[PDB]
C-alpha cells in the first residue's frame, strides 16, 4: 500500500500535506516524496537545487521519504 499523488499524508510524521510527486532527489540519495503542507511549515516552495518536482504554495513544499510519509485518512 504505497502512496499516491493527491492523497492526504504526513511528511515526517509531524507535518501534514498532500502527495504531489514521488521519486529521487538531485541533492539526496535514495527515494523521496513530495507533499504539499496544509500550512507554511515547509522548507521549499516545491523545488530542490533549482529543480521543481511539483507546484505548491510558498513554504508549503516538503520533501520526505515514502516510508516517512503516511496517510492521515484513517
Amino acid at each position: 500500500r504505497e502512496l499516491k499523488i493527491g492523497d492526504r499524508v504526513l511528511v515526517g510524521g509531524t507535518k501534514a500535506g498532500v502527495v504531489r510527486f514521488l521519486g529521487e532527489t538531485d541533492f539526496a540519495k535514495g527515494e523521496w516524496c513530495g507533499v504539499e503542507l496544509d500550512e507554511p511549515l515547509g522548507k521549499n516552495d516545491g523545488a530542490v537545487a533549482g529543480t521543481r518536482y511539483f507546484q505548491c504554495q510558498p513554504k508549503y513544499g516538503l520533501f520526505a521519504p515514502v516510508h516517512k510519509v503516511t496517510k492521515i485518512g484513517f
Partner: peptide, 8 residues
C-alpha cells in the same frame, strides 16, 4: 522517536 531530519 520515529527519527527526524529526513525531510527538506
Amino acid at each position: 522517536g520515529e527519527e527526524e531530519g529526513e525531510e527538506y
